[PDB]
Curated annotation (Swiss-Prot):
Interacts with PARP1; leading to activate PARP1 in absence of DNA. Interacts with PRKDC. Interacts with XRCC5/Ku80; the interaction is dependent on nucleic acids. Interacts with XRCC6/Ku70; the interaction is dependent on nucleic acids. Interacts with EZH2, HDAC1, HDAC2, SUZ12, YY1, LRIG3 and LIG4. This is Protein mono-ADP-ribosyltransferase PARP3. Widely expressed; the highest levels are in the kidney, skeletal muscle, liver, heart and spleen; also detected in pancreas, lung, placenta, brain, leukocytes, colon, small intestine, ovary, testis, prostate and thymus. The chain holds residues 178 to 532 of 533 of the full protein. GO terms for biological process: DNA ADP-ribosylation; double-strand break repair; double-strand break repair via nonhomologous end joining; negative regulation of isotype switching; negative regulation of telomere maintenance via telomerase; positive regulation of double-strand break repair via nonhomologous end joining; protein auto-ADP-ribosylation; protein localization to site of double-strand break. One of its GO terms (molecular function) is catalytic activity. The modification ADP-ribosyl glutamic acid is found at E55, E127, E128, E162, E267. It comes from Homo sapiens. It catalyses: L-aspartyl-[protein] + NAD(+) = 4-O-(ADP-D-ribosyl)-L-aspartyl-[protein] + nicotinamide; L-glutamyl-[protein] + NAD(+) = 5-O-(ADP-D-ribosyl)-L-glutamyl-[protein] + nicotinamide; L-lysyl-[protein] + NAD(+) = N(6)-(ADP-D-ribosyl)-L-lysyl-[protein] + nicotinamide + H(+). Belongs to the ARTD/PARP family. Its main location: nucleus. Auto-mono-ADP-ribosylated. The modification ADP-ribosyl aspartic acid is found at D34. It is found in: Nucleus; Chromosome; Cytoplasm, Cytoskeleton, Microtubule organizing center, Centrosome; Cytoplasm, Cytoskeleton, Microtubule organizing center, Centrosome, Centriole.
């Protein structure tokens, strides 16, 4: 019988690791995406099955631009769904097609967290095992350091959250962790000369936090949105909090949000949706879909991160009269290369 070593993590990090690897949180997420967890359990999830589902969706994509019913029936056989034992709806719109692609991008991140927890033979040939939470923490290959309430960047982040959060239903700050993805430091070096660095929000499903802490923010071949195939960020917390899918934990609703250091370089501004973009125009390093409002730039502050100055908005959203006429209520900041982002903070919000 193998000795289990004591946990080295603080209570807040223990809770975080428990939540982002929680089998119930993963099964809940699959129930919320209408998947059949009985016909497709977490242990049975495979990369081949997810690849097969994307192939069916790529085939359905062509048929929109074999009937839609035949091709939909094949997708629903590969990726089992639960719909009160009724006929599954045919994927006959670019909206329902992107929804199923978003569902599969989440499920691929669930599979990743599942593949990551696989007990290897090198782990089986050791007489002392780490505490389960230490083991899951170590599989991330990502240093997480709980921030102190007295650290200067804690107050800068808290102000950013409070000033740009939803006016009434303001998310309550619980914890801030410094994120040091060991692998992201060397890739971000290939953008050291690129200026205009800003700390921006990235809100997400609890089910994809583990995959992001292991692999960073990525541009997958089937991802998209109103500003094309890139990594999406916001200068307003309330905008990113909309993509935060949390979970019921007692009386509270716990969720996680990221702060990323984004090297924006030369910005290209737009005021109309362009879902076909895959890069900025020549000479530009980022695209900004300009909102009706923007955190007051007069109140911007800076943080020094690895010798570089990073702009941190501190002001409340104020009108952008040039972009009063914009299809975007709130701004969306886009980069089209993964190396232009560096994960810096992880926030727990209730
Ligand atoms: O995880 C995300 C989106 C995160 C996201 N997070 C943001 O912080 C954000 C800010 C500005 C504009 C878009 C933004 N999108 N999307 C998933 C596909 O992988 C699907 C999804 C998740 C939540 C709500 C709607 C769709």
């Amino acid at each position: 019988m193998k000795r289990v070593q004591p946990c080295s993590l603080d209570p807040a990090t223990q809770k975080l690791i428990t939540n982002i690897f929680s089998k119930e949180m993963f099964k809940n997420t699959m129930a919320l995406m209408d998947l059949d967890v009985k016909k497709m359990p977490l242990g049975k999830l495979s990369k081949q099955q997810i690849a097969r589902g994307f192939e069916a969706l790529e085939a359905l994509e062509e048929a929109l631009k074999q009937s839609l019913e035949e091709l939909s029936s094949h997708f629903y056989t590969v990726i089992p769904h639960n719909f009160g034992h009724s006929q599954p709806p045919p994927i006959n719109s670019p909206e329902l097609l992107q929804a199923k692609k978003d569902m599969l991008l989440v499920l691929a991140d669930i599979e990743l967290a599942q593949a990551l927890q696989a007990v290897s033979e090198q782990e089986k040939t050791v007489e002392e095992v780490p505490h389960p939470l230490d083991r899951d923490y170590q599989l991330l290959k990502c240093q997480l350091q709980l921030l102190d309430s007295g650290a200067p960047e804690y107050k800068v982040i808290q102000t950013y959250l409070e000033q740009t959060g939803s006016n009434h239903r303001c998310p309550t700050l619980q914890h801030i962790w410094k994120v040091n993805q060991e692998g992201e430091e060397d890739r971000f070096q290939a953008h050291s000369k690129l200026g205009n660095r800003k700390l921006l929000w990235h809100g997400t499903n609890m089910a994809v936090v583990a995959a992001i802490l292991t692999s960073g923010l990525r541009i997958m071949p089937h991802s998209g949105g109103r500003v094309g195939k890139g990594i999406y960020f916001a200068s307003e917390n309330s905008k990113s909090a909309g993509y935060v899918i949390g979970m019921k934990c007692g009386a509270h609703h716990v969720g996680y949000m990221f702060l990323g250091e984004v090297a924006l370089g030369r910005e290209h501004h737009i005021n109309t949706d362009n879902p076909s973009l895959k890069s900025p125009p020549p000479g530009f390093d980022s695209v900004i879909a300009r909102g009706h409002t923007e955190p007051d730039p007069t109140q911007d502050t800076e943080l020094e991160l690895d010798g570089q100055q990073v702009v941190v908005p501190q002001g409340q959203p104020v009108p952008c009269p040039e972009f009063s006429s914009s299809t975007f209520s709130q701004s969306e900041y886009l980069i089209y290369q993964e190396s232009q982002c560096r994960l810096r903070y992880l926030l727990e919000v209730h």
